Design a protein around this ligand. Structure first.
Ligand SMILES: NC(=[NH2+])NCCC[C@H](N)C(=O)O
Ligand code: NA
Ligand code: NA
Ligand code: NA
Ligand SMILES: [Zn+2]
Length: 866
């Protein structure tokens, strides 16, 4: 297919102000009548190009005049000779039952529902499918009352009727103009959880949460979470919900997570449903995160939307930032910060190195679901966070205020947002704008000198961004670089120069520069890049003792955890090299001693302890190497675990029992203590086998909740303890009728360290709870294998690659978006060694060859093969 470029953006030749939709719903054959009020801004010779895909056009009228001047060409309806103002009427047919791709209107079990972001509304009718066209929607739905008793669209019920033949209809009116990507329609039968929330200003909002019949007991957390989101957006941003009613529909068949359709959010049911014995702490906190996320979109995405899709980060960067702040306010900010950094370093960095590398504001896009990426979302959020870091909270809020004042009700650009922050704060961000247009992860090298004569510390900070596949030119960024200097007592040395204080966030704006600090009264141990103040790789020659010092003394828990990650980083790289030579793990006693200290520190926050005692993921570890040896990394992680499990056996067991809790609560102290207890159990699993098998079996069976049961189940798989198969069989026998609970089991299987792991995953394509028609199952099994089990995917015989190629051959026709998610491990071939590349290249060349290759895959494959 054909590529699209940000720099060609042009205001449209026509606009639409108002659209009245009617749907005659039926799964096999739905008929759509779309009456649109339109305007020509452009020139008379220039026709209206409307977008449409897989549409059966029944009729076209202009002001009730059957129109003759038009043609369907590929993917568009082109209409000529139009008035300056006219009523467009289209009628067309679509078939939700045939919609396996889950774009547009499709069927999720017995229900019908929509996904229109990014360019899905064109699968529903011929429209100006672009988010710079905003209009007021009115939506009429006609359906069989028995199959589809509930008929939902955005806004308010303004009309209702019954009909002959057991059909009924309902009409919705959304007062706020919107881009079609925000349109939603759900029809079906549901249990409905109903509550209300009153805004600070007195507006009473009806809350309706629609779940499949029988799931009303799993709904209350999500509700509480919505209410908390509404409260928090009020307290922190001063923003209030703007309609009378808030609907959420949880459906099972969904490609991504959730969607912010105005007043009618549609969620993957994985981020709604929870109960203490089906969902984990992580699940609860994810439900909290995503409910919040889609709610915060109501202002940052909906009241202010994107001028075009290249501006996607304008809303996702900002909205993610907002869900991070939400979770951090209500929970542990540090645990939150830590995990978000794990993700930046572990996954996003890898993408910014990949052939799919792109700035948070892309300049070129072929298929736009491919840019719903770790980069646009998470790095985009770090970019927001840097603006926040640079302006401080009060000015950051003044900028938010200016942004809405300026742009409420319209579509905007990333640049509009930066300008609003600049103008409201009077901090200059012209240079800082380069973060929007430059891909790749900058590397920051730091050098230091203490001079005792002058009591001066000197930092020489230099930066480079290496070239990426997408960009041959790179240039210095405006890098906000936070530091603290500690003296030998653990106290903080006040930063200064020439008598007057110095803000501890340095403006690193050049390829190379120097900072001097006066009155540094003792040779300092520095904390560098505090709080991960910019999304960069830091190069500084730490000593173990500097790092252990910081683990004991740094003010911010983040810097303690992070020091530990640097300490470990070194010994991971040592042992991968060793593993390649056939040598066992080697590890200095003082390294093990540092972690013993964390286990016995009575004062440390268990949440922090637990993160420090969590080894980097294999994905995090991979980022330490130019060439990746996935097997060595996997085996080294296993050995590092085994070793600490031996060295710290008694302390690990002590802390495990000490954190026992008879009561289960989703509450941040209880989650911390539990996260610690399970971190310990993990190590103990790799210790002496009989005690392991006993502790792990006991917790599986005695557990009063899914967090504890799964941690044990998961440890049995990881450590291949003798009780494993029994426990796995039992989870199957209990939970097999339950998709979302099974997803956890499929993930364990797909990630098992056993040697017959691929053979098992194939068998599981037949399992009773698996099916290729459900993205969630696909990702629990196939995805978790290919992306979260690198050792097996990258098995030397190329067997992992051929497996994924089979699956992708299916998925390319069935569901290109899911296929594109799954290909990603394969387009990383250049991080690996030559023999693996050659096989991976071949695998890609084969997929390139598929008859009817999707745009979604073509994009990644051609870049990967370039
Ligand atoms: N087809 C899709 N799932 N597109 C992406 C929708 C993601 C949604 N806007 C979110 O940020 O949560
Ligand atoms: Na408009
Ligand atoms: Na609110
Ligand atoms: Na907090
Ligand atoms: Zn979002």
């Amino acid at each position: 297919p054909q590529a699209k470029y940000r720099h060609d953006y042009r205001a449209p030749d026509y606009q639409i102000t108002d659209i009245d939709l009617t749907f005659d719903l039926d799964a096999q054959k739905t008929v759509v009548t779309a009456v649109s009020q339109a305007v020509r801004h452009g020139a008379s010779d220039a026709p209206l190009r409307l977008n449409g895909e897989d549409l059966k056009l029944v009729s076209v009228h202009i002001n009730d005049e059957p129109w003759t001047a038009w043609k369907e060409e590929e993917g568009a309806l082109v209409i000529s000779n139009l008035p300056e103002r006219f009523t467009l009427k289209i009628i067309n047919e679509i078939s939700p039952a045939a919609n396996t791709a889950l774009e547009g209107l499709y069927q999720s079990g017995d229900a019908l529902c929509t996904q229109c972001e990014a360019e899905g509304f064109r699968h529903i009718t011929y429209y100006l499918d672009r988010p710079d066209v905003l209009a007021r929607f009115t939506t009429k739905i006609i359906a069989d009352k028995i199959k589809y008793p509930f008929l939902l669209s955005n806004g308010n019920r303004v009309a209702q009727g019954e009909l002959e033949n057991g059909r009924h209809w309902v009409q919705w009116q959304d007062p706020f103009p919107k881009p079609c990507y925000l349109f939603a329609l759900v029809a079906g039968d549901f249990d409905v959880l109903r509550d209300t929330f009153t805004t600070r200003s007195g507006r009473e909002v009806a809350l309706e949460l629609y779940v499949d019949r029988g799931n009303l007991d799993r709904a209350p957390w999500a509700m509480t979470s919505l209410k908390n989101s509404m409260k928090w957006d009020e307290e922190r941003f001063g923003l209030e919900y703007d309609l009378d009613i808030y609907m959420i529909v949880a459906v099972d068949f969904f490609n991504a997570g959730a969607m912010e359709n105005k007043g009618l959010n549609i969620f993957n049911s994985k981020y709604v449903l929870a109960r203490t014995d089906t969902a984990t702490d992580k699940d609860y906190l994810d439900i909290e995160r995503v409910i919040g996320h889609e709610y915060f979109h109501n202002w940052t995405g909906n009241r202010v939307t994107c001028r075009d899709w290249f501006q996607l980060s304008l809303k996702e960067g900002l909205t993610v930032f907002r869900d991070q702040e939400f979770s951090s306010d209500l929970g542990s900010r540090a645990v939150n910060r830590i995990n978000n950094v794990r993700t930046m370093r572990g996954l996003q960095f890898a993408e910014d190195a990949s052939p799919m590398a792109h700035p948070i504001r892309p300049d070129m896009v072929i298929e736009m679901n491919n840019f719903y990426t770790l980069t646009v979302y998470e790095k985009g959020a770090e970019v927001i966070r840097m603006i926040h870091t640079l302006l401080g909270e009060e000015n950051f809020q003044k900028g938010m205020q200016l942004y809405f004042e300026r742009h409420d009700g319209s579509a905007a650009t990333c640049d509009d947002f930066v300008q609003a922050m600049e103008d409201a704060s009077n901090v200059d961000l012209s240079h800082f704008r380069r973060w929007y247009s430059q891909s790749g992860t900058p590397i920051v090298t730091v050098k230091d000198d203490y001079n005792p004569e002058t009591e001066q510390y000197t930092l020489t900070i230099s930066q480079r961004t290496p070239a990426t596949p997408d960009q041959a030119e790179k240039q210095p960024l405006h890098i906000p670089f936070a530091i603290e200097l500690y003296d030998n007592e653990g106290k903080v040395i006040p930063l200064q120069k020439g008598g007057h204080p110095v803000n501890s966030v340095l403006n690193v704006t050049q390829a190379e520069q120097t900072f001097v600090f006066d009155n540094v009264y003792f040779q300092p141990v520095p904390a560098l890049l505090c709080e991960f103040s910019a999304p960069v790789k830091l190069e500084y020659k730490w000593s173990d003792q500097q790092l252990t010092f910081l683990m004991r003394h740094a003010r911010n828990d983040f810097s303690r955890w992070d020091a530990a990650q640097s300490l470990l980083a070194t010994y991971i790289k040592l042992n991968v090299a060793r593993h390649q030579q056939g040598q066992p793990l080697s590890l200095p006693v003082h390294v093990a001693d540092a972690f013993r200290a964390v286990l016995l520190d009575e004062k440390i926050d268990p949440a922090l302890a637990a993160e420090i005692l969590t080894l980097p993921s294999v994905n995090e570890m991979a980022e330490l190497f130019d060439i990746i040896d996935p097997i060595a990394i996997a085996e080294v992680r296993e050995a590092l675990t085994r070793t600490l499990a031996t060295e710290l056996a008694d302390e690990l067991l002590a802390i495990y029992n000490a954190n026992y809790q008879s009561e289960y609560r989703v509450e941040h102290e209880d989650i911390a203590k539990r996260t610690l207890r399970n971190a310990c159990l993990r190590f103990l699993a790799f210790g002496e086998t009989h005690l392991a098998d006993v502790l792990v079996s006991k917790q599986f069976h005695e557990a009063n909740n899914m967090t504890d049961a799964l941690a044990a189940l998961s440890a049995a798989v990881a450590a291949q303890l003798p009780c494993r198969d029994a426990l796995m069989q039992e989870y199957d026998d209990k939970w097999h009728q339950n998709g979302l609970v099974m997803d956890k089991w499929f993930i364990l299987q797909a990630t098992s360290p056993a040697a017959n792991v691929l053979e098992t995953v194939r068998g599981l394509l037949q399992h009773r709870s698996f099916t290729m028609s459900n993205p969630n199952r696909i990702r629990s099994l196939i995805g978790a294998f290919a992306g979260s089990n690198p050792a097996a995917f990258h098995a030397e015989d190329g067997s992992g690659y051929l497996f994924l190629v089979e699956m992708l051959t299916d998925l390319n026709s069935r569901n290109p978006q899911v296929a594109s998610r799954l290909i990603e491990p394969l387009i990383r071939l250049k991080r690996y060694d030559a023999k693996r590349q050659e096989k991976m290249r071949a695998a890609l060349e084969q997929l390139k060859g598929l008859e009817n290759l999707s745009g979604d895959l073509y994009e990644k494959i051609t870049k990967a093969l370039a």
